[PDB]
Design a protein around this nucleic acid. Sequence first.
RNA 1: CUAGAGUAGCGAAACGGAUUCGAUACCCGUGUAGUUCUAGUAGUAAACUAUGAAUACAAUUAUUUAUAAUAUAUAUAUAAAUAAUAAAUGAAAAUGAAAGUAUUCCACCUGAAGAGUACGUUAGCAAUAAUGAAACUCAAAACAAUAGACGGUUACAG
RNA 2: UUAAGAGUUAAACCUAGCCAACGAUCCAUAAUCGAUAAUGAAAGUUAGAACGAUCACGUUGACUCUGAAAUAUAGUCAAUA
RNA 3: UUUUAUAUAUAUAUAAUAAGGAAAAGUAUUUAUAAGAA
Lengths: 43, 101, 53, 155, 56, 49, 131
Amino acid sequence: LRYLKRDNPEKYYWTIQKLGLNDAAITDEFNMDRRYMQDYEFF
Amino acid sequence: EATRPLSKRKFFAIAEIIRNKGQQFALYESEAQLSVAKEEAQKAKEFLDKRSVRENKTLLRDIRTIQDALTPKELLEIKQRETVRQLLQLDISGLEVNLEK
Amino acid sequence: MSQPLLRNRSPEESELLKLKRNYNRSLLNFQAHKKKLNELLNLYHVANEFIVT
Amino acid sequence: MSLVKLANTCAHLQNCSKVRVALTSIPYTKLQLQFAYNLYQQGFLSSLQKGSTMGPDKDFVEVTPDNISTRRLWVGLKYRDNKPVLSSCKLISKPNSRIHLPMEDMKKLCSGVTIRNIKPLQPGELILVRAHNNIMDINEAISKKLDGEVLCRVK
Amino acid sequence: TPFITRIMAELKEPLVLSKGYNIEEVDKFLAAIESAKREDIEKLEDRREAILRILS
Amino acid sequence: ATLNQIKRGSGPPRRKKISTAPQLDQCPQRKGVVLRVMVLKPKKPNSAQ
Amino acid sequence: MLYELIGLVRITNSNAPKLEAKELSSTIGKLIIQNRGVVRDIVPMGIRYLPKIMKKDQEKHFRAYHFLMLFDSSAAVQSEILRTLKKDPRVIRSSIVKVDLDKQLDRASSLHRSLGKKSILELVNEDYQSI
RNA sequence: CUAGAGUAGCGAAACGGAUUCGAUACCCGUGUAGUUCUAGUAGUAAACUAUGAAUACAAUUAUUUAUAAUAUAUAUAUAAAUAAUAAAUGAAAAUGAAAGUAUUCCACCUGAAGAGUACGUUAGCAAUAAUGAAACUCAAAACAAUAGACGGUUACAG
RNA sequence: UUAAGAGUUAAACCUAGCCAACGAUCCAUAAUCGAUAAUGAAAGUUAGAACGAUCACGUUGACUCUGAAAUAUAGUCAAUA
RNA sequence: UUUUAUAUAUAUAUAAUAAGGAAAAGUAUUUAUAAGAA
Ligand SMILES: [Mg+2]
Ligand SMILES: [Mg+2]
Ligand SMILES: [Mg+2]
Ligand SMILES: [Mg+2]
Ligand SMILES: [Mg+2]
Ligand SMILES: [Mg+2]
Ligand SMILES: [Mg+2]
Ligand SMILES: [Mg+2]
Ligand SMILES: [Mg+2]
Ligand SMILES: [Mg+2]
Ligand SMILES: [Mg+2]
Ligand SMILES: [Mg+2]
Ligand SMILES: [Mg+2]
Ligand SMILES: [Mg+2]
Ligand SMILES: [Mg+2]
Ligand SMILES: [Mg+2]
Ligand SMILES: [Mg+2]
Ligand SMILES: [Mg+2]
Ligand SMILES: [Mg+2]
Ligand SMILES: [Mg+2]
Ligand SMILES: [Mg+2]
Ligand SMILES: [Mg+2]
Ligand SMILES: [Mg+2]
Ligand SMILES: [Mg+2]
Ligand SMILES: [Mg+2]
């Protein structure tokens, strides 16, 4: 999705909106650390 | 570009924007939101319609009744609901003719 | 050394190539679906032995 | 223009010289073709040929995007007096450190003076320079008064 | 998110068949086979139900 | 050994000549007062007073 | 999913060994069909002495009526069938194994497949099966 | 290590029996924690291939291993694993498709000992884990291989 | 207010920002440099005595007049002697 | 190779045929410079 942003920004925003995600969720560094699983209540 | 001191730490001012990628990234965002809403609504309408069709919902028995006929009233009702060939024409034939084309 | 390395594909050549590729895709899809229909027919031929009642 | 690919080609030619194969294949690109032509003009390579991944072209084949992936440039190596003519092939300007020299520094390098830790040109050696997407020997680039990127050494 | 919910719903609808089969297509194919053979109704319905259960 | 590792501070150790007479504070010599005169025994294989 | 069940039913009545296997087959088949299942085949293996004097609950068994059931069904009711089998005193031993249907929709049991008959269509032979 | 349950065998510690100049050890008996399960803390091993990852190339043989064919036979072709090698490299042992020819990135090292020690800081319920010196002493210290001696080192003969 | 910009200083009202593991903030140390000196094949490394350029200081700290320019080796006040 | 022939259904299988030969005498400055030993 970051490549899609670098290539076709309009389709990038369309796709992330359709999939239920935002720009921050794609661009920001992400690890499935215990902090994420606690904050978002994965379990 | 260089400028008089405008604050403690600010000594430069923008002069022009060669690439408007940052500007476009918000216009496209809003447009994507607006378009996704309407496309969602349309596809949800289609799904609800299909649910209604499946709610409304015997082809073998019906076709056999037409075949044996070749009684009159039920036959007419089934007609409203080579005719056997038309009612059983399969999408695979369309694929075959398209491939040949 | 100072001339183009390759000859660019014309739009007409690209159209013909795309038509060939689409035909290949649709052909493979067709054999897949027809094989699936054949398996369905073979299963129908033996559905009588299967107990559902 | 990948300097990585030129390094790979240099190592490939060195390996081929060690095992003494009479023919070898390298990627078919403008930079590689110009580099091979420059080596051939100096006499380091016996022959240039255009071909596929399997071998030289039996008949002339036009180069198009359809077959570009499978195109190769086949070079014939020379072994004279029980010694390889093309013995060592190295890079001066590496991808991590790229060296662009002005003309006067290029003359100084040819004249025995070490410039930016590059060993000076040796008598029977050839140094290749790239200027305006054209590959030439250092002497020509000096005669053309062109500032350029100093790529490789062939001794 | 509308898209994931729609896809999950369509998966969870009744009379959804696996292995790339479509219920209407299967019914039409079975009727075509019966017509071709013609050219016991509870037993034909039993074959249909067994096929649907297997492919459900 | 990599270029970026040399950039960050990697390189040959300095041939730094450590001072063998630190207490003089980089002076050719210093005046002093004798606290005691001591007679030591040298390390073997040397022997003397 | 196609599941092959191999049950080892106990023989208590020396005069009619098949009765208990009949009752068990009826129960399992009824469960499978009433929970949206299909019973493709029931292969009646014979009476065989068990390899050892196997023990279920307090009774000790030396022989058993072996039987096989090939049935297409879902995972949940398959686990339910297994649970009913394990607690039933009649079933000395039970085992359910998946028969994969990724390539061919119709497959025979392990016994017929080992004999050489890959499918049940081959089992019932092929005449006027090209319709 | 922290809570619960479990505890058949094994078994730190402990209690005794032997051996011994002495036994604080090896051997023997009873055996606590632990080994086990669940819910956690911690994040160290000779955590080793003592060999970071990716890419291009590099001469053979033999087996397998996995595919693709062609009619068991083509000692069939394409790949990877394994073994021995050529060149190459190396202080050598040796590596051998990497310890070779090249490119890119990261981590690490700068004599032995003091020392992974002290102090401080961070985290953990704690044991501890991470980070991590300096003074002083010395001309040492280590790796591979060579020839010897030696072994409560093997086998073969006389 | 200045001849002059600016949180430089003084006042007012808003925004939540700014720097930082490519090392902030804090601490220790240090006058800086050259077509100057030493050394090296050179890149560099060391010095900053002597020649030359810049800065700061004239026992310590703050402020004031004059002035174009001074917190002046001035004046006032205090500290030290 | 190329071209053509016969035969067979624009193409395929067989057979023949190949244009690349030119000669002549005479016409320095090179650079900067890295040594180890017990
Ligand atoms: Mg401002
Ligand atoms: Mg416990
Ligand atoms: Mg225990
Ligand atoms: Mg014990
Ligand atoms: Mg001992
Ligand atoms: Mg003991
Ligand atoms: Mg434990
Ligand atoms: Mg943990
Ligand atoms: Mg430890
Ligand atoms: Mg460690
Ligand atoms: Mg290690
Ligand atoms: Mg080594
Ligand atoms: Mg520690
Ligand atoms: Mg202002
Ligand atoms: Mg301020
Ligand atoms: Mg204010
Ligand atoms: Mg700092
Ligand atoms: Mg000072
Ligand atoms: Mg000073
Ligand atoms: Mg001076
Ligand atoms: Mg200094
Ligand atoms: Mg002086
Ligand atoms: Mg002053
Ligand atoms: Mg003063
Ligand atoms: Mg004084």
